[PDB]
Every structure is written in structure tokens, then in C-alpha cells.
Amino acid sequence: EEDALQMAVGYFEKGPIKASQNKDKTLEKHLKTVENVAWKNGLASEEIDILLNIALSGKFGNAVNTRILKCMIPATVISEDSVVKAVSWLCVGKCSGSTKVLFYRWLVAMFDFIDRKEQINLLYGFFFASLQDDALCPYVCHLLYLLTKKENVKPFRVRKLLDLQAKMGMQPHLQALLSLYKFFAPALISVIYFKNSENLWKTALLAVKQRNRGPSVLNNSLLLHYINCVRDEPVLLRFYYWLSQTLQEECIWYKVNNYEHGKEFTNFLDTIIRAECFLQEGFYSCEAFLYKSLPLWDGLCCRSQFLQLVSWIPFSSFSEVKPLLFDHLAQLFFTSTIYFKCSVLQSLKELLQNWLLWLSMDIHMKLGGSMNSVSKLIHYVGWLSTTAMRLESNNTFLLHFILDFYEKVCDIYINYNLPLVVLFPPGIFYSALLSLDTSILNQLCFIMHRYRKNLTAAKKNENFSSKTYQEFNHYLTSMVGCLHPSFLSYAVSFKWSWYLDYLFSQGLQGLKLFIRS
Amino acid sequence: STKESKNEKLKEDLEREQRWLDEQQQIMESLNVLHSELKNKVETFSESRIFNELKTKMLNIKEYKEKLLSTLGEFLEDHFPLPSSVNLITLHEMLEILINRLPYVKISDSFWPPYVELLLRNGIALRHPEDPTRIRLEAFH
Amino acid sequence: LEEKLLDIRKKRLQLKQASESKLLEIQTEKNKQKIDLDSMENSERIKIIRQNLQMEIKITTVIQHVFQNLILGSKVNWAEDPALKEIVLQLE
Amino acid sequence: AGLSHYVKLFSFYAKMPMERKALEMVEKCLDKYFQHLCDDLEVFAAHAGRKTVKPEDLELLMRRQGLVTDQVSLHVLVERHLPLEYRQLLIPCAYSGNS
Amino acid sequence: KRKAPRGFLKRVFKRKKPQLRLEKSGDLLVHLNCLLFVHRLAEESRTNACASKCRVINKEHVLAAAKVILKKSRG
């Protein structure tokens, strides 16, 4: 009926309203009641777009009465906008200025639904030259904002927009169009925003959407992949220079507020750390900033952020990185509480993982002088973590993080393919074996089992062979003979095999793995 | 309380690293197929063949120009001169020739004022900002 | 979780160094296209036809834009005509 | 009304801040301008012999202000100030049906 | 501001003179008359404010502006 009713309206269009026997409105009101259920099919929307506005009855109330609810059911097609580009033809009929305003309002509001926005984009100048009209400007500007592309920014259009701005007043629509043209080829420079009066039509547009449903580089993750794939100079040098001048200016910003600036710099350091974790190499401006700002650094000022930048450091020789960084992450390590000792042994635990990731590929990409650097890092942390339990009297919370570091030191050969199985210092292994809680005892036992596995694996493909095996057997005979108050407490909570099964069922995973040896 | 936080930041970082690895595999296959395609696709470009493509563009653009100008001869018969005052086509082409090598005069106020105010409203030509007895064709370049 | 994270990180580093190798190969292939550009800079007959293209499209971007402003202002009946339909919607 | 719209135009035509009591004086200035325009138009039309006033009776009054000249014709000034649809009705375009 | 009032201009024309027949687009042309009037007033007020070197337009500048603009704009 909807198609037949609009052909009936067309029959009214071929004759005068006085000569007609029936009302022109009532049929269109039945059509409006239909639109309240279903507005217009693509062909139906096309037809009611093309004829009802050119020259015929199309009363400025009746035409608008439709145009309010004339929106498409499926979408708008190319043939819809074609013959109504002959409605913007703007002549003896002209679809007069009130219905013209409604027309461009419809073109903005239903601009989300076009099968080919490219065809309308190729109709750019036709709407652009209609922008000279004062009544159409606030809506033609929005339409062109949704219509714009680089091929439509010819310099004569730029100077026409500037002439419109000079002749007319400063307007948010023109301001939006000019800022967008500046976003494109900058023939103009200028420094509201999708603000529509279609909010009343948006409720209708909301029903239409429901009906359709029923029928410089840090804050860019999609471009961060590009710089992840180029270790070029003109890309990591512009990045070095922005990053250094942002870690300096925003760090000087600390020296004036230090209270609210510690939430944007902290949230900027967090984005830096996230970008480094994604890109998987320490930015050359973040060790250059750490080397500058570590001696000045206190314990808690951006602790979780400074000690995540330490983890992302390019692999350097320990004789050249220890004095610059590890001599200040020990000056601070030994003078700060357990919550900085654990936040550095966690920092250097991730640093070891990052230095081993880039060293496994140095085996994949075809050593000895880089080998001695990760070995020295482990020995230095093992020196940090053996005197940390001296300052803190073998604090179990600190020992948990210490063995978390060596949790990634045992599993070097199996995991990172590096022949760098490096054992505990005696003061750490024996103070974990003689600890009082089972949650660090079984961690040490698991690390011993992983040391067994890695030494056996290193015996296969092949100093790591003589002294490491001697000290490891030293640790083995000490622990396997001792394998205990924490276990005493577990036994109080409670036939040697039954006791072992009770321990094993109570989460004793590392102990079970090492006993299975 | 800190090994639960480590496990939380481990699961969150595991999801984030899985997403990053998926996006890395995508730009791995895409980069490899782009290298394979561009290998012996744009590398097989001769300077002589490159100039031949520019000659094809010469003929295509010349035929597009002869299409636009043929339509400027056909459709502008709907316009048509009626009754010297110059024909609209001729005064428009005398605008175009003047801007073609430049001028800010272009018509020196060509006659039939409905015709000069025809090609002034739509953006075809412009008045001179100081002496408005002289015309310029909007500098479409 | 840490084992899976280590495996994912090793895969990602392998596909990062591999991607840098592939993108460096693509960039040096673009440099290889740059000497093809130098094969254009000989300028015995590429320059003249390039200048003719620039000086004739600028006439084809004028008559085109006096069709977006002449199939607009007049009594155009713009798209209700098969002839102007392929000449309106003018390609850039 | 019209004078209120005109002082709103004064805001973007003077491009420099104003005072409310000063725009109330621009109100009487606009009324005083019209008290001359309506009886200058009447006499310019009366010499023309027409009880109505036609556009060409007003380009002559434009020449009396002198802001229309041989260099800046009547059709020029409508271009620089009135909008497109507000300028379509005065100057004749050409569609073989020139307004 | 891009506006031009049809109705109030005709009402003012009828109020000041009860005997006239301002044509279909003669309202448009009297609106252009006052457009150029207000343009002249704005520019010459800028001029005489520069003469007084006042950064803000005031009563004394526009009072002198009236006796010049509305006198030459008079027919």
C-alpha cells in the first residue's frame, strides 16, 4: 500500500488540488501512520525524496511533515540523492528556504546511512556552493564536515570559505569546517563540534537505528606498530628528542607542584612503560633519563614507574651500566625499606627477563662478552639480595621477591637457551632452606628442581660445567639431607608417604617437583 | 597480597601480550605478503614504460577535457545567447583564456549583465576586491 | 602464566626482529624504486609531458569546477538527465 | 525588532565591544536614519511619478549616499553584504528567465 | 551574524510612512540601504574613536558619527 499510496499522491501531483476530489493531506497522513510503523523502503524513500520537493504540491508544511519522518528504513541509495540534487537545484520551485533547511537537516541526520558515501563526496562542490546561503550554512557546514575528503579541498574552496568567514560572522559551523580543512592540506591555518539541531529528529533517528538493527607516537597503538617495525634513525631520533624533552620538562614540573603533577607524569610514565612492553626494547631516552635522574631519585617518587623503566633498558656491558644505574639502585636499595628492596628485585627481575629475551635472539641471530654481562647482573643482584636479608634480618616478604628473581634465573637455559645457569649465593639458598614459612621453602625447592632440569639440559648441548655443578651439588646435599619447623607446623596441622601426600595435596608443588627428581 | 597483585597484573599482561602477539602476527603476514607482492610488481618498472603510462594519462586526461568541453558546448545550448553582448560560451572561454596564463580583468566587464552575474554567484568568477569593474575566474588551480 | 607470557614474548620478539627485517627490505626496495625515480629525472621527454599534464589538468580542473557551478546555478535539471549524469559526478 | 537585529549586526560590523546604553542610542540613531529614508524615498518616488517605490528609485538614493559609484555599481554592493538567497531576488541572474 | 529581517523592516516603513507600496523585493533593497548605513557608521566610528584614541566605542564618538553619517546618507 505504501508504494500504491504514494503513486496516489503522484496522481494528486498531476492535477490541481481544487480539481481533486479527495484531500491531498489525508493520504499522506495515512502514509505518516505507516512511517510510524515503517518509514520508507529504499525505493520508496528514493521516490518520496525525488518527486515531493521539485515543483509539485509538496506544501511547505506537507513536504516538511513528510521530511520529518521521511527517513529510510534500510538506508539511502545513490538514486535517492541523484534526483534530489535537482531539488538543491534552487530555482522557480527551489523547495523554499524552510523546506531547504529541513532538507539539509535531513541530509546531515541521515548521513550515517548511505550505501556509497563516495558518490556524495564526489558531489562535494554542489553542496559547497550552496553554503553561500545564510539559512543553509549551519547545516551545509555539518554536511560538508561529514562529506569531506582530501580531493575536495581545492584551494579555491579554501579561499571561498575564508571569504565566507570574512563576509559573515565568526560561527562554530564555519570554524569546524575551517579546522577540518586545516586538518587536510594546510592552505589555511586556524586553531560547535558535531552539534546538531537534529536532536528532535534523533529520537526518530534513534528509532531508525533500532529499526535498522532489527532489520608524538605513544598515544597511538595502531601506529606504534610501525615504529616497532623500524629501528631507523629519523624515527628513533625524533622519539629520543621528544621523550627526553618530555621526561625533562614534566620532571621539572615536579619541582613546582610535586602533588598533582605526580598523576600526569605518572600516567605518562605508565604509557611509556606500556609502549616499551609492546615494542619490547627500552627506549634510548628512558635509560638516558634514568641515568640522569637516578642519583637525584628518592625511593618512592614514581617508584613503580621508575623501576619499570629500569626493566626496559638496552642490553649493555655491566662495566658500563652498573656505575651509571646499578650503583644508584644500590645506593637506594640499601637505604630504603623492604617495599623498595622488593620493588627493585622485582624491577631487576624484569630487567633480567628483558636482557635474556634480547640475548636469546642474539643466539637466533648468530657471545661470551654479552654472556658475562647477564652473569654479572645475576651475581650483582645476588649480592643485592644477600645483604638485603642482612639489613632486613632475612625478611620472608623480601626473600619471596629474592627467589622470584632467581625463579627466572634457574629457568635460563631451558627458557632463553642461554648457557647461564647461575646458582644462589649461599646466604640466600640456605636462608630460604632454613626459613620458617612453607610458601618460600617450596619456592626454593622448585627453583632447585628447575636448576636440576637446566643443568641436565646444559649437559646435553654444552664455568657453567665445573664450579656451577660443584656448588649445585653442595646445595643439593644440604637440602636433600635436610628434607624443619615450617614442615613441623604442617605436620602439627595433621607413614612418611602419607605425610608427603598430605603435604603435596596442600599445594606443595615445588617440593613435589623436586622430590620427583 | 602481592602475589595476588602479581597474578592479576600477570593475567592482565597475558591478555595484553596475546592481543599484541595477534596484532604482531597480523602485521607479520601482512608485511610478508606486501614484500612478496611489491617484489616484481613495482620493481618491474621501466623508465620508457613509465613515460608510456604518462602518455596514456596524457590521452585519458585530454579525452576527459574534450568530454568536459564537448559538454560545455552541448549543455550551454540550454543556456544559449538570445539577443552583441557576447555569447555566454565565448565570454566564459575568454574568462578561461585570461586566467589560463594570467589576471584580475578576464572580462573587463563583459556585457549582458545577467550573464556576468550568472557566473559570479555560483563561484565561477570573482569580483576584484578594490575596483569591481573587472573579473577573475576564481583561480580554480 | 609466566611461562605462557615468556613464550608469547619470545614469539613477539621473533616477529618483531622478523618484521624489522621485512620492513627494512621493503624500505630498501622503495629506495630501489628511488633510482627508478632517477630513471625519470633524466628529463628528456618525461619532463615535458609531466609539465603538459600539470598545465592541462589545471584546465581540466577549471572546466570541471565550472560544471559543478554551471550544472548548479542555472535551470539545470542536473541529475534528471542521462547525459549530464555521467558528466555530473565528475571524477577527480 | 529590526533595529535590535541591526545592533546585533553592529556587534560584528564594529568588531569591538559595546555598551547597552550605547546600543539604545544606536536604536534612536537607526530610527532617525529611517525617519529620513522613508521621506527621502517618498520624494524620490514622487518625482518618478510612482506612488510605489521601485528598486531604481533606491539605487538613486544609494548614489545620494555616494557609496554606489561608477566603479561600484548597484549590483556590486548587494554582492558584498547580502547573503546568497537574499541577493538572488535583486540582481538578475540568467537562466533564460532572468529575475 | 548572517541575518536579514523581512517583517520588521516593512513594519518600520509602514509606521514612519502610511502611504507607500514597497515592492516585493524593495524591502530587500532598503535592508541593503541600512546595511551600508551601519557599515559606514561602524567604520567612521572606528575612525573618530581613533581620533579620540579611545579603545572602546562610546557615546561622544557615535553622537558625532550620527551628524555625519545620517547627513550624507540623507538624500
Residue numbers in the entry:
A (entry chain I): 62 to 252, 260 to 283, 365 to 515, 526 to 621, 631 to 651, 685 to 695, 715 to 737
B (entry chain K): 109 to 191, 205 to 223, 230 to 268
C (entry chain H): 150 to 241
D (entry chain T): 458 to 556
E (entry chain W): 14 to 88
Task: Give excerpts from the publication.
Initial 3D classification and refinement resulted in an EM map with an overall resolution at 3.3 Å of CCAN complex, estimated by the gold-standard Fourier Shell Correlation method. The 3.3 Å map was of high quality and was used for model building. The CENP-HIKM sub-complex is comprised of the HIKhead and HIKbase domains connected by the anti-parallel coiled-coil α-helices from CENP-H and CENP-K to form a V-shaped structure. CENP-M, which adopts a small GTPase-like fold, is located at a pocket on the surface of the HIKbase domain formed by the C-terminus of CENP-I, the N-termini of CENP-H and CENP-K, and the CENP-LN sub-complex. At the CENP-QU C-terminal, parallel α-helix bundles, extending in a hetero-dimeric coiled-coil, form the vertical line of “b” with CENP-OP and CENP-R at the top. Assisted by AF2, residues 302–306 of CENP-C were assigned to the density associated with CENP-LN subcomplex in concordance with a previously identified CENP-LN binding motif, which supported the kinetochore recruitment of CENP-LN by CENP-C in vivo.
The CENP-A nucleosome (CENP-ANuc) is surrounded by a group of 16 proteins, the constitutive centromere-associated network (CCAN) and organized in various stable subcomplexes. Human CCAN is composed by five modules of CENP-C, CENP-LN, CENP-HIKM, CENP-OPQUR and CENP-TWSX. The arrangement of the four sub-complexes generates a b-shaped structure, in which CENP-OPQUR adopts an elongated shape to generate the arm, and CENP-LN, CENP-HIKM, and CENP-TWSX form the semi-circle. The CENP-LN sub-complex, located at the center of the ‘b’, functions as a node for coordination of the assembly of CCAN by contributing the contact sites, with the sub-complexes CENP-HIKM and CENP-OPQU on the opposite side.
